[PDB]
Structures are given as structure tokens and as C-alpha cells.
């Protein structure tokens, strides 16, 4: 029906993220329709687990006239680290809450940095607790600080919408402040562009399996992540070895022959001129020249704690774990940031990885870190090298 957008509140503890979330649901419900949620519901964050990693996360939903929002909110800075690196949803945009009284604080900076590292494309600022501040000059100063901070991490500080509001007053029914929640909603609508639907993006299919079908040749199977592959189209085979070219000479689903395969569908793609031996675990079919193989990259990683089922001991420079991208492990070596000799269970670090075989990747690609099958960490490619 409507574009689905992933958003969430970020910023320092006690600046009013949870209150703002409650106020957004409430104000949009009574204006546009929906179900209002209350501070104490959202504040009481349920614990969720995905492959060992425990995160206290609250999920709410709200609607504007044109868009539907899945909105994430977390109690602790520890959860934001985990959620941003390894969480289910990747954010299309974040709302940075900064309390007008305090101004920018350490976690304000950390979340902006993390935002950049994990590829959070857009940030909008809600300048909160403006009911506690009457001197307009001070609001301007706090705003300028935030704009500066955002620019430091390559966000367009000068151009980022900043809304002067009060989450509490708006949650309590003050129409004058509820108007500011609506201004924020407008910026979500207007400033975060409509998310590209997978079908519209360049074709990509991670290869899960391979067969030689009698009287046709080599078929590669998987789910179409993005785009459309049609019979006759050229495709590249990227990863593990030098990229290969071929033509799609068929798309099968179960027993039905199709002229194309679309994002979301599990299909078998027949490849002209390609042997079964020329297909390796970890490769993707891609629209020619739309995704490149890389061996070395910069990453933000979270290392599982003892409790989460991770390592007991810490690792050092000479650590060579399995890096799980899409379908398969690939061994790699690491380089740690200056003045770091060690990494403990539960730490998160910037980490430069060098893979032994290349993998098709762009910035934003998620991965797990494994030791003989068992997940010991998780991460996201921050910059390809
Ligand atoms: N005066 C005022 N207080 C607020 C506002 N928003 C939140 N608070 C208060 O700040 C405290 C922390 O808010 P909370 O939403 O829990 O912050 P979080 O730690 O970022 O989730 C609570 O006592 C709120 O009532 C506001 O706009 N004005
Ligand atoms: C949870 C699975 C990994 N795991 N779990 N418990 N310990 C480990 N890893 C190691 O012991 C280890 C052994 C030799 C060298 C190094 Cl660098 C690390
Ligand atoms: Mg909170």
C-alpha cells in the first residue's frame, strides 16, 4: 500500500528518545490515524536475540499520510552499538535527539560516528526539552554545535533539519508542542527520500546451489535479492575468483520455465558457457559492472560476550577467523586500530579485514565472524578498500 521506512531514535541517555517515540505514535495517531503507545510500554524494552546476540529493543510503528514507519528505540548505549551493527532492520534514517539543556554529549557523538560507520544514510535532529529553555540564543548555539558535530562525521550539518520541540509537553497534550512533533514527521516524510524497492535495484542473486541439468547445462540456484534477471540478459559471476561473464539462457521455478526471475523469488538461472567447476561457494550473479569483488575492507564489528555464547579469551593481531558473507565462510586476517593490542568478549571495534579470497561487496554489507561454525562476532563493512 505505502512505502515502508526504517527509522529510530538515537542520542545520549536521558535526552528523551523514549518520550519522543511515545509522542510520535500518540500525536500521529490522533492527527492521521494509528495506535498511540505510552512511554512506559516503549521504555520497558523487551530483550530480543538473533544468533546469540542479546539486545534490549523496542519496536513501534506509526503512519504519516504517505508513509508507514518501523521505528526502533533502545534503553542503553550498549544496545544501540549492538542494534546498529547487528540488528534486524537497517535504518533508512535516524532521529538524533539532543536535549537543549545539556547539548551534545559523548553518546551523541558515538551514535553519529556509528551511524556513519554502519551506513545510516540520513539524520534528522529533534532538539528536545525546549520547554526548559526560554533564551532563544542558547537554542541557536546548541543547534550550531550539533551541525558542527554532524559535519565532523561527513553528514551535511548545515542542511540537516533541526526541530525545536518538547517530547514531554507534546505527549501531555499541549497543541503548540504537538505541532512540533508534526513538523518532525514532515521532515521524516520530506528529507528521507522514498526507499528504492528491491525490484528497482540492479540484479543480484547469491548462489546457494549448483547443478548440471541434462541437456541444458549449469544451473545456479538462490533467492533473487534485488532486481530482475530476464532470459537473454548478460550477467557477471563475482567473488572468490576473477569475475566471469555469461548469458542467462533460462529461469526455472520448480518445474515452470519463466522468461524472468524477480526479487524475492527462489529460482534457478541457466548460464551459457559455464561449467559446474567454475562456480564456487560465496559467489553472486550480478547485473554486469554493478558490484565489484574486494578482499580488504574497514568494518565496525561487535564481538559476542561469554554469555552470548562467544569466546572466553581475547584475540590479538594474528587472529584469522571465518568471515561469513551471505552463504559461506571466508578466512581473513585483521588489523587493529592504533593503541589496541587486544579485543575482549563484548567489545566493539573498528577493524580492517583482509580476506584470502575476494567477495562481492558494497559498503553496508553485513557479516558474521565464526570459529569452526559457531558465531563469535558480527559486523558491517564501513568502507571497501
Ligand atoms: N522538560 C522536559 N523533560 C523531558 C522531555 N522529554 C523527556 N523528558 C524527561 O527526561 C527524562 C528522560 O527521558 P527519556 O525519554 O527516558 O530519555 P531517553 O533516556 O533518551 O529514553 C524523563 O524524566 C522525561 O520525562 C521534554 O521535552 N521536556
Ligand atoms: C566460541 C568458539 C570460539 N571459542 N570458544 N572458546 N574459545 C574459543 N576460541 C579459542 O579458544 C582460540 C583458540 C586458539 C587460538 C585462538 Cl586466537 C582462540
Ligand atoms: Mg530510553
Automatic annotation (TrEMBL):
Keywords: Cytoplasm, Elongation factor, GTP-binding, Hydrolase, Magnesium, Metal-binding, Nucleotide-binding, Protein biosynthesis
EC class (word): hydrolase
Entries under SUPFAM superfamilies matching the protein: EF-Tu/eEF-1alpha/eIF2-gamma C-terminal domain (SSF50465), P-loop containing nucleoside triphosphate hydrolases (SSF52540), Translation proteins (SSF50447)
Subcellular location(s) of the protein: Cell inner membrane; Cytoplasm
UniProt: Mg(2+) binding residues: 18
The reaction(s) this protein catalyses: GTP + H2O = GDP + phosphate + H(+)
Gene3D superfamilies, alphabetized: P-loop containing nucleotide triphosphate hydrolases, Translation factors
Secretion signal, residue range per the UniProt entry: none
Membrane-related topology note: Peripheral membrane protein
Superkingdom: Bacteria
Record EC number: 3.6.5.3
Main function: May play an important regulatory role in cell growth and in the bacterial response to nutrient deprivation.
Family: Belongs to the TRAFAC class translation factor GTPase superfamily. Classic translation factor GTPase family. EF-Tu/EF-1A subfamily.
Known partners and oligomeric status: Monomer. Heterotetramer composed of two EF-Ts.EF-Tu dimer complexes. (Microbial infection) Upon infection by bacteriophage Qbeta, part of the viral RNA-dependent RNA polymerase complex, the other subunits are the viral replicase catalytic subunit (AC P14647), host ribosomal protein S1 and EF-Ts.
Entry-linked NCBIfam families: EF-Tu, PRK00049.1, PRK12735.1, PRK12736.1, small_GTP
Protein name: Elongation factor Tu
Organism from which the protein derives: Escherichia coli
Gene: tuf
Amino acid at each position: 500500500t505505502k512505502p515502508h521506512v526504517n527509522v529510530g531514535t538515537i542520542g545520549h541517555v536521558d535526552h528523551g528518545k523514549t518520550t519522543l517515540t511515545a509522542a510520535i505514535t500518540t500525536v500521529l495517531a490522533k492527527t492521521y490515524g494509528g495506535a498511540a503507545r505510552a512511554f512506559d510500554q516503549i521504555d520497558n524494552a523487551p530483550e530480543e536475540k538473533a544468533r546469540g546476540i542479546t539486545i534490549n529493543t523496542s519496536h513501534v510503528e506509526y503512519d504519516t499520510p504517505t508513509r508507514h514507519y518501523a521505528h526502533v528505540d533502545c534503553p542503553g548505549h550498549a544496545d544501540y552499538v549492538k542494534n546498529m551493527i547487528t540488528g534486524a532492520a537497517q535504518m533508512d534514517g535516524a532521529i538524533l535527539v539532543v536535549a537543549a539543556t545539556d547539548g551534545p554529549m559523548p553518546q551523541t557523538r558515538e551514535h553519529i560516528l556509528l551511524g556513519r560507520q554502519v551506513g545510516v544514510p540520513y539524520i534528522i535532529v529533534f532538539l528536545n526539552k525546549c520547554d526548559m529553555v526560554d533564551d532563544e540564543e542558547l537554542l541557536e548555539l546548541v543547534e550550531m554545535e550539533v551541525r558542527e558535530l554532524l559535519s565532523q562525521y561527513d553528514f551535511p550539518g548545515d542542511d540537516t533539519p533541526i526541530v525545536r520541540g518538547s517530547a514531554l509537553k507534546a505527549l501531555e497534550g499541549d497543541a503548540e508542542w504537538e505541532a512540533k512533533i508534526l513538523e518532525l514527521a514532515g521532515f521524516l516524510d520530506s528529507y528521507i527520500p522514498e526507499p528504492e524497492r528491491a525490484i528497482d535495484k540492479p540484479f543480484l542473486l547469491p548462489i546457494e546451489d549448483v547443478f548440471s541439468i541434462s541437456g541444458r547445462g549449469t544451473v545456479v540456484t538462490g533467492r533473487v535479492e534485488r532486481g530482475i534477471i530476464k532470459v537473454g540478459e548478460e550477467v557477471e559471476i563475482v567473488g572468490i575468483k576473477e569475475t566471469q561473464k555469461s548469458t542467462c539462457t533460462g529461469v526455472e521455478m520448480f518445474r515452470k520455465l519463466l522468461d524472468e526471475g524477480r526479487a524475492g523469488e527462489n529460482v534457478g538461472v541457466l548460464l551459457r558457457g559455464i561449467k559446474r567447476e567454475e562456480i564456487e561457494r560465496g559467489q553472486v550473479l550480478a547485473k554486469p559492472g554493478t558490484i565489484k569483488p574486494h578482499t580488504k575492507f574497514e568494518s565496525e564489528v561487535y564481538i559476542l560476550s561469554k554469555d552470548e555464547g562467544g569466546r572466553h579469551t581475547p584475540f590479538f593481531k594474528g587472529y584469522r577467523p571465518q568471515f561469513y558473507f551471505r552463504t559461506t565462510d571466508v578466512t581473513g586476517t585483521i588489523e587493529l586500530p592504533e593503541g589496541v593490542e587486544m579485543v575482549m568478549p563484548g567489545d566493539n571495534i573498528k577493524m580492517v579485514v583482509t580476506l584470502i579470497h575476494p567477495i562481492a561487496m558494497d559498503d553496508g554489507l553485513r557479516f558474521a565472524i565464526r570459529e569452526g561454525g559457531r558465531t563469535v562476532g558480527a559486523g558491517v563493512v564501513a568502507k571497501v578498500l
